[PDB]
Amino acid sequence: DVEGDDCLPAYRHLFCPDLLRDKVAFITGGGSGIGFRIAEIFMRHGCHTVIASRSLPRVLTAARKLAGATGRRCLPLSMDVRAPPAVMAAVDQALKEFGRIDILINCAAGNFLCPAGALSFNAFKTVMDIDTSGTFNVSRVLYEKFFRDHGGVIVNITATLGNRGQALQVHAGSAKAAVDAMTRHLAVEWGPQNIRVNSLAPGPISGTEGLRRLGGPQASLSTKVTASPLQRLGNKTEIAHSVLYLASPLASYVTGAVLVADGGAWLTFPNG
Amino acid sequence: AQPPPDVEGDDCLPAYRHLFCPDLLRDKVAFITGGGSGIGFRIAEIFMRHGCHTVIASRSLPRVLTAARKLAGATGRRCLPLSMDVRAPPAVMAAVDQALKEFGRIDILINCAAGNFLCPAGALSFNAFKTVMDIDTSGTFNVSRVLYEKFFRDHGGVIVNITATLGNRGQALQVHAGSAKAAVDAMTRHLAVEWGPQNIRVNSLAPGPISGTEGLRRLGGPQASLSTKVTASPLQRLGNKTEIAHSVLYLASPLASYVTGAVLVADGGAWLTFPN
Amino acid sequence: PPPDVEGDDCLPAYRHLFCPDLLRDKVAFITGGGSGIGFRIAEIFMRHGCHTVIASRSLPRVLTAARKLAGATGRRCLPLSMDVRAPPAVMAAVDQALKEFGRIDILINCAAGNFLCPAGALSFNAFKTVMDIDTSGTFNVSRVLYEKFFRDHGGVIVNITATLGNRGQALQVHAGSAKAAVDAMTRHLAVEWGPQNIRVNSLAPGPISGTEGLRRLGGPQASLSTKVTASPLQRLGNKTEIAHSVLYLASPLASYVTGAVLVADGGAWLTFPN
Amino acid sequence: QPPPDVEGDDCLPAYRHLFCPDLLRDKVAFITGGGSGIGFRIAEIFMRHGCHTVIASRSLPRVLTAARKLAGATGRRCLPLSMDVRAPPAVMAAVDQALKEFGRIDILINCAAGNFLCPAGALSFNAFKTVMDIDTSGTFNVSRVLYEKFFRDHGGVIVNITATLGNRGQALQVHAGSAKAAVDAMTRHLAVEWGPQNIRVNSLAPGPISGTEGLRRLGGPQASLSTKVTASPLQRLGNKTEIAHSVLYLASPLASYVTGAVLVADGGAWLTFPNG
Numbered sequence A: 001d002v003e004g005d006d007c008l009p010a011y012r013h014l015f016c017p018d019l020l021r022d023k024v025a026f027i028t029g030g031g032s033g034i035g036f037r038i039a040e041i042f043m044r045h046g047c048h049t050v051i052a053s054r055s056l057p058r059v060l061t062a063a064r065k066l067a068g069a070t071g072r073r074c075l076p077l078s079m080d081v082r083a084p085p086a087v088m089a090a091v092d093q094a095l096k097e098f099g100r101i102d103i104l105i106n107c108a109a110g111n112f113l114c115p116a117g118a119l120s121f122n123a124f125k126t127v128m129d130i131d132t133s134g135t136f137n138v139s140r141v142l143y144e145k146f147f148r149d150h151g152g153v154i155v156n157i158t159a160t161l162g163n164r165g166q167a168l169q170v171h172a173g174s175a176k177a178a179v180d181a182m183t184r185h186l187a188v189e190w191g192p193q194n195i196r197v198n199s200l201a202p203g204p205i206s207g208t209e210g211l212r213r214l215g216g217p218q219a220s221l222s223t224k225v226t227a228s229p230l231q232r233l234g235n236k237t238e239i240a241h242s243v244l245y246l247a248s249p250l251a252s253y254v255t256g257a258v259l260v261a262d263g264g265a266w267l268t269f270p271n272g
Numbered sequence B: 001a002q003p004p005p006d007v008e009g010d011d012c013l014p015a016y017r018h019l020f021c022p023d024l025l026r027d028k029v030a031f032i033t034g035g036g037s038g039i040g041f042r043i044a045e046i047f048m049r050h051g052c053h054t055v056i057a058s059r060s061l062p063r064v065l066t067a068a069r070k071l072a073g074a075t076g077r078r079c080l081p082l083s084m085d086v087r088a089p090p091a092v093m094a095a096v097d098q099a100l101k102e103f104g105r106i107d108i109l110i111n112c113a114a115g116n117f118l119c120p121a122g123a124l125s126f127n128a129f130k131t132v133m134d135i136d137t138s139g140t141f142n143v144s145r146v147l148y149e150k151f152f153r154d155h156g157g158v159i160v161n162i163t164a165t166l167g168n169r170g171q172a173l174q175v176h177a178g179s180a181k182a183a184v185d186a187m188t189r190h191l192a193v194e195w196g197p198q199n200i201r202v203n204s205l206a207p208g209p210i211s212g213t214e215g216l217r218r219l220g221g222p223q224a225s226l227s228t229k230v231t232a233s234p235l236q237r238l239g240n241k242t243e244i245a246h247s248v249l250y251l252a253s254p255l256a257s258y259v260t261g262a263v264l265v266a267d268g269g270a271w272l273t274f275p276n
Numbered sequence C: 001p002p003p004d005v006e007g008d009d010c011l012p013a014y015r016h017l018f019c020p021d022l023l024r025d026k027v028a029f030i031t032g033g034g035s036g037i038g039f040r041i042a043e044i045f046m047r048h049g050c051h052t053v054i055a056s057r058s059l060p061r062v063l064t065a066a067r068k069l070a071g072a073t074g075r076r077c078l079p080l081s082m083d084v085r086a087p088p089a090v091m092a093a094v095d096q097a098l099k100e101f102g103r104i105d106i107l108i109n110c111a112a113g114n115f116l117c118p119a120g121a122l123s124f125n126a127f128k129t130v131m132d133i134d135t136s137g138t139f140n141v142s143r144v145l146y147e148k149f150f151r152d153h154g155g156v157i158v159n160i161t162a163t164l165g166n167r168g169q170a171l172q173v174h175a176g177s178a179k180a181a182v183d184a185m186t187r188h189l190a191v192e193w194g195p196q197n198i199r200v201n202s203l204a205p206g207p208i209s210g211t212e213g214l215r216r217l218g219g220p221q222a223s224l225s226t227k228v229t230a231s232p233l234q235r236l237g238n239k240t241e242i243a244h245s246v247l248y249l250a251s252p253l254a255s256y257v258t259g260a261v262l263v264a265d266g267g268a269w270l271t272f273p274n
Numbered sequence D: 001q002p003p004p005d006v007e008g009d010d011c012l013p014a015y016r017h018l019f020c021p022d023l024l025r026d027k028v029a030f031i032t033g034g035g036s037g038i039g040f041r042i043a044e045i046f047m048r049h050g051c052h053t054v055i056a057s058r059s060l061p062r063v064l065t066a067a068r069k070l071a072g073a074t075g076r077r078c079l080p081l082s083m084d085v086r087a088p089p090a091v092m093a094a095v096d097q098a099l100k101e102f103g104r105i106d107i108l109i110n111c112a113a114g115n116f117l118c119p120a121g122a123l124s125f126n127a128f129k130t131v132m133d134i135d136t137s138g139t140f141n142v143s144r145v146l147y148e149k150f151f152r153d154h155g156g157v158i159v160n161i162t163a164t165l166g167n168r169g170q171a172l173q174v175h176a177g178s179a180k181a182a183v184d185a186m187t188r189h190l191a192v193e194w195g196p197q198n199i200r201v202n203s204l205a206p207g208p209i210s211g212t213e214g215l216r217r218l219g220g221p222q223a224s225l226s227t228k229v230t231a232s233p234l235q236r237l238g239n240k241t242e243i244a245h246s247v248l249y250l251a252s253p254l255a256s257y258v259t260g261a262v263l264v265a266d267g268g269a270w271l272t273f274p275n276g
């Protein structure tokens, strides 16, 4: 893996390189962090991407690196997942450029550490809007604009925070638990349109804004990482492999599932 | 086996036999959002029948006034009716100040306020989804958060969140409510962990299909097909609001001194067998 | 927190929060009722008008319990020797109970076995013995109860379980696995037996003072008190607290509750180290 | 549009790689129940990815017939062994013989199980305990022997085949639901203890799968099954190849960061299937 939002210098295939040949994946948050590596790894298996987030310069920069490293197409778009007309405009544009969308990865999210007693009403609601309503919004627009009529696959990038009520995280754990339930609800309603919907819940991942923001001090982090079952942080590529699995015809019979890829961290990490 | 008595409407029970001691919550005060109708009305009544005063808070001032008169009249306890939207933190803050000025303490918070309706996820508008999130999830947070600041942080207290089982199986026509209620269940865990040291217990209670409630009216669907699924459910009957109020009273009371961070399902096993 | 005593002795006083007649003239059959949690459960039931049958392997253990329980409460306590793994002995014990009281209203599956052991060092027979006592044994007394009385008259079952299996607690593969099976069993029996008017729920305790489980598995005093003070309610639970939640589930106040797992652990599984 | 399958315990007559065919190159997988149903298809698919297999169950005819077909179809080695997961000394012999023959074991798939429909009231103690013994004690016995004999010192991957039965307490299945739920917990326990020796442990819980003894015994009548399958999210039964794909994913370097997890691969079936 690479720490920054840059592409791998080399890659060995474990899935066939034509696994998503000529498919198109729409990736919210695909300009940094996990969403960046997911876009890269999809493109190394023949997939074209659309990457969409608020920051136009961020997606433009990412798109040039992704296309450069892989030779597939990456369409960068500016859109806030909370603004349905912008989501609609983005999906219209993707359809016009590529003609099809096969996979939606809902990776956009926001998080920060804060005691629940100190978190403002707006702060709590901002996270629910971005993670939960934003995931609903983008799924809801895809369904309507393409997936209802053509089938499709969704992966929701979630978390394990809500499992044990991770301190300082009431906002993110609540929103992410909402998205996991949302995964089952959509899996039930939309499966008969040939749409699969699963969640993938990463553990602590090196080279991501999430870890830089939420990981805490270095010394306290190593101790919890060393006491976790695989004894290390996960990396962006490993997460992208799991997401790629779930988005691919190799998960043809998998829907309504939450796959945890955390190295067993949620089983042992401290809380309180 | 006979359930305890209930009445279909938002009226008090004409008789009641105690199974908890009548002084279980002697002179305590409970703040109940949505205490003017349905489950929250019956919760308020049963609490007041165990010695508790209540504050009942929801949007509609006529609704809580009508409710408050009935509740005091049937129980000899004090009920303060307050108009307050759980989504509007200045309104929640003013309602909590008024309650504390009236009573000088609040011991229990019941988050019962919510919104729901049947709608396919493919026809649900963005505003519709978000509105449910706002009332169930953000409103429960806002009221808990304001209670924390104004009293519980310094004095302890007990929260009971009224949730649902909708999200366990992804119940059709219900993505909004099931998502909202699953967030609240996580919030229960989160607050129990952070607020435990302040002597605050937080739990969820998740009801099954309940007779005499607007949620059954709106969500239960056609009578004949509702009967089929109830009869096929393990206790073969709808729950009633008084049964749900007993489970809430259990969690809100010193009988649950060691219960925090837990979700108690009171649904007669419905989620295990209902169709999806 | 309501008072408790460390030993298998009755409370010297007790404040009622349920009505004293909550279980008037019911009969509860309680496996493991001669020590620890089950003994306090028998006591608290009997202080609510209920008679008890307490059954475990050691007749000495249940004889001395029954004497203490009947003396403290003025209700009846029948002590029986019975291994939950042994259908003929389980059948005999339930026949005796019915001969004695003419009814059983409530079953509490509290009998269990446990100890700390790393998975790689645990023998095949040690793993299977825990499975046998906790899971097959609970099934055994439950089905025997069904066939002899609950099928035709209704009843209530509470299974005492654990949170060990949620995060896969180290040194506890056997007990975590066994208790997660009983929680599934709770849902299965609730479904099949609900239409005969039988409710089935699980109660999963946290770390409880005054118990063999805490003595055996709590570990050194100083690492125990560190995790305890780092847990949400910052204390151990006590046996009276668990009995109160068990009594709740066993009682008509939980008329609409079945197939549920109620966790009573002061939030300890959310925060305890693994 | 699923990958192809054959109904009987025969190899696929054609195949298209979606994983690289060297994904498990020169590894050895020990598979209990590897001579029929889902375990047969796991062995084949692993063999098509460069893996040698050892298949172990009670019936020698079964695993003899299987190992010939598997070697024939793939060009890899398949060591068949009579072995009862319930007998530790036979488990120890079989693992010793696998290690003698191959020099290594990389992967363990615990697929051996037993099941049948029976109401709890008609299920005897011995019947319940039998299913607990094969499914739970057996999966423990095999993992424990592998651990000591090889995985402790060399690392490894275990996949336990489980089920969703215990989620909603599926009728007529108290035995299998209980045993499988115990296995999903053991997955978590083993991952926590054995992770630091470089061993991953995950569960894979299949839905109703065509071409299996489990479907034949449990699926019930055709008409009633079709109805429930047609009303499930993907509107079809899973097949053995799809399950093999998921199991291979978990057993492979693509799942390097996955441990203590349960992957449900059931086409959403547990969400909607009736629990009559």
Ligand SMILES: CCCCCC(=O)SCCNC(=O)CCNC(=O)[C@H](O)C(C)(C)COP(=O)(O)OP(=O)(O)OC[C@H]1O[C@@H](n2cnc3c(N)ncnc32)[C@H](O)[C@@H]1OP(=O)(O)O
Pocket (backbone or CB within 6 Å): A109, A110, A111, A112, A113, A114, A119, A120, A121, A122, A123, A124, A126, A127, A130, A159, A172, A209, A210, A211, A213, A214
């Ligand atoms: C383990 C990780 C898994 C979980 C998910 C992730 O990791 S995501 C990985 C980490 N990456 C990110 O979060 C990247 C994207 N994040 C963001 O954009 C931000 O952090 C954000 C979510 C607040 C930004 O959104 P917006 O611009 O919409 O909102 P804005 O900054 O106006 O803030 C809205 C409210 O949140 C409050 N707020 C913002 N930061 C806060 C903080 N650190 N602690 C407390 N409260 C805070 C603000 O004060 C304000 O409340 P008031 O109005 O009361 O002042």
Ligand SMILES: CCCCCC(=O)SCCNC(=O)CCNC(=O)[C@H](O)C(C)(C)COP(=O)(O)OP(=O)(O)OC[C@H]1O[C@@H](n2cnc3c(N)ncnc32)[C@H](O)[C@@H]1OP(=O)(O)O
Pocket (backbone or CB within 6 Å): B114, B115, B116, B117, B118, B119, B124, B125, B126, B127, B128, B129, B131, B132, B135, B164, B165, B166, B177, B207, B208, B209, B214, B215, B216, B218, B219
């Ligand atoms: C097991 C069963 C569990 C049941 C438990 C429960 O959850 S609660 C028990 C049920 N009782 C209830 O009171 C349900 C709550 N009552 C309500 O409907 C609530 O008052 C509410 C959720 C709509 C909130 O009302 P508001 O006045 O804030 O909102 P408003 O009426 O402006 O509607 C907000 C958005 O929702 C959409 N909307 C409203 N009703 C809708 C419906 N039946 N089907 C589809 N969409 C609907 C609206 O058109 C609007 O979207 P646009 O902007 O697109 O027009």
Ligand SMILES: CCCCCC(=O)SCCNC(=O)CCNC(=O)[C@H](O)C(C)(C)COP(=O)(O)OP(=O)(O)OC[C@H]1O[C@@H](n2cnc3c(N)ncnc32)[C@H](O)[C@@H]1OP(=O)(O)O
Pocket (backbone or CB within 6 Å): C112, C113, C114, C115, C116, C117, C122, C123, C124, C125, C126, C127, C129, C130, C133, C162, C163, C164, C175, C206, C207, C212, C213, C214, C216, C217
């Ligand atoms: C936080 C939640 C925790 C809750 C706590 C609980 O669940 S209840 C916990 C507290 N209470 C109790 O356990 C009291 C009852 N316990 C018991 O009776 C026993 O300890 C028991 C569980 C083993 C059951 O006794 P049995 O007579 O049936 O079994 P027996 O004595 O033959 O032992 C069976 C196998 O287990 C192994 N064994 C026994 N104790 C062991 C130990 N401390 N460490 C490792 N292995 C052990 C034996 O060596 C033997 O294996 P070999 O044949 O291979 O030699």
Ligand SMILES: CCCCCC(=O)SCCNC(=O)CCNC(=O)[C@H](O)C(C)(C)COP(=O)(O)OP(=O)(O)OC[C@H]1O[C@@H](n2cnc3c(N)ncnc32)[C@H](O)[C@@H]1OP(=O)(O)O
Pocket (backbone or CB within 6 Å): D113, D114, D115, D116, D117, D118, D122, D123, D124, D125, D126, D127, D128, D130, D131, D134, D162, D163, D164, D165, D176, D180, D206, D207, D208, D213, D214, D215, D217, D218
């Ligand atoms: C939707 C999700 C689905 C989930 C999927 C799954 O897990 S199912 C996938 C697995 N499917 C299978 O292939 C099952 C194949 N396995 C089998 O060998 C058998 O059914 C078995 C486990 C019982 C066989 O083992 P044994 O030969 O050791 O057992 P044996 O016949 O001696 O029986 C042991 C005890 O069980 C009782 N028993 C056995 N079969 C029974 C039945 N159909 N109904 C009632 N009781 C039965 C016996 O009478 C005896 O108890 P008494 O001593 O009282 O007489």
Ligand SMILES: NC(=O)c1ccc[n+]([C@@H]2O[C@H](COP(=O)([O-])OP(=O)(O)OC[C@H]3O[C@@H](n4cnc5c(N)ncnc54)[C@H](OP(=O)(O)O)[C@@H]3O)[C@@H](O)[C@H]2O)c1
Pocket (backbone or CB within 6 Å): A028, A029, A030, A031, A032, A033, A034, A035, A052, A053, A054, A055, A056, A058, A079, A080, A081, A082, A106, A107, A108, A109, A110, A111, A130, A134, A157, A158, A159, A160, A201, A202, A203, A204, A205, A206, A208, A209, A210, A211
């Ligand atoms: N890192 C971890 O250890 C970890 C652990 C568990 C879960 N996760 C999850 O993994 C995902 C990515 O995490 P990360 O650590 O990789 O953080 P990251 O790089 O900050 O990714 C979050 C992305 O969200 C986009 N985004 C935020 N708000 C948005 C909005 N309103 N509309 C559209 N786009 C928005 C951001 O781009 P803009 O700023 O340009 O909008 C950014 O690319 C998140 O879903 C997170 O919850 C991460």
Ligand SMILES: NC(=O)c1ccc[n+]([C@@H]2O[C@H](COP(=O)([O-])OP(=O)(O)OC[C@H]3O[C@@H](n4cnc5c(N)ncnc54)[C@H](OP(=O)(O)O)[C@@H]3O)[C@@H](O)[C@H]2O)c1
Pocket (backbone or CB within 6 Å): B033, B034, B035, B036, B037, B038, B039, B040, B057, B058, B059, B060, B061, B063, B084, B085, B086, B087, B111, B112, B113, B114, B115, B116, B135, B139, B162, B163, B164, B165, B206, B207, B208, B209, B210, B211, B213, B214, B215, B216
């Ligand atoms: N009935 C069931 O079968 C069932 C099943 C599972 C869960 N539940 C849960 O049970 C609780 C009670 O539901 P119920 O069926 O009895 O329905 P209900 O009578 O309609 O109660 C909901 C209450 O919420 C109040 N409310 C709605 N929005 C609000 C807001 N923004 N601010 C403040 N108050 C608000 C309403 O009063 P105003 O209109 O006056 O504001 C109302 O009194 C809910 O949490 C519900 O999700 C019910």
Ligand SMILES: NC(=O)c1ccc[n+]([C@@H]2O[C@H](COP(=O)([O-])OP(=O)(O)OC[C@H]3O[C@@H](n4cnc5c(N)ncnc54)[C@H](OP(=O)(O)O)[C@@H]3O)[C@@H](O)[C@H]2O)c1
Pocket (backbone or CB within 6 Å): C031, C032, C033, C034, C035, C036, C037, C038, C055, C056, C057, C058, C059, C061, C082, C083, C084, C085, C109, C110, C111, C112, C113, C114, C133, C137, C160, C161, C162, C163, C204, C205, C206, C207, C208, C209, C211, C212, C213, C214
């Ligand atoms: N203490 C805690 O912190 C804690 C935490 C979570 C769960 N629990 C659960 O609470 C319950 C009681 O635990 P405890 O700590 O109070 O331990 P305890 O006093 O040792 O109780 C266990 C009882 O089970 C009986 N028993 C054991 N094997 C038996 C068999 N084969 N047949 C019949 N009876 C059998 C024992 O009596 P005989 O020796 O006379 O048979 C003993 O009375 C158990 O289910 C335990 O798993 C306790």
Ligand SMILES: NC(=O)c1ccc[n+]([C@@H]2O[C@H](COP(=O)([O-])OP(=O)(O)OC[C@H]3O[C@@H](n4cnc5c(N)ncnc54)[C@H](OP(=O)(O)O)[C@@H]3O)[C@@H](O)[C@H]2O)c1
Pocket (backbone or CB within 6 Å): D032, D033, D034, D035, D036, D037, D038, D039, D056, D057, D058, D059, D060, D062, D083, D084, D085, D086, D110, D111, D112, D113, D114, D134, D138, D161, D162, D163, D164, D205, D206, D207, D208, D209, D210, D212, D213, D214, D215
């Ligand atoms: N088929 C489904 O729809 C479905 C659904 C959920 C889960 N599953 C699970 O998938 C796995 C395979 O099931 P299947 O439906 O494919 O049925 P299956 O072909 O009968 O497979 C079960 C295998 O277990 C072996 N076995 C049984 N007891 C054993 C013992 N004591 N020791 C060693 N081996 C033993 C059997 O062989 P011997 O008789 O030769 O020992 C048989 O090969 C099972 O774990 C089952 O629980 C299946």
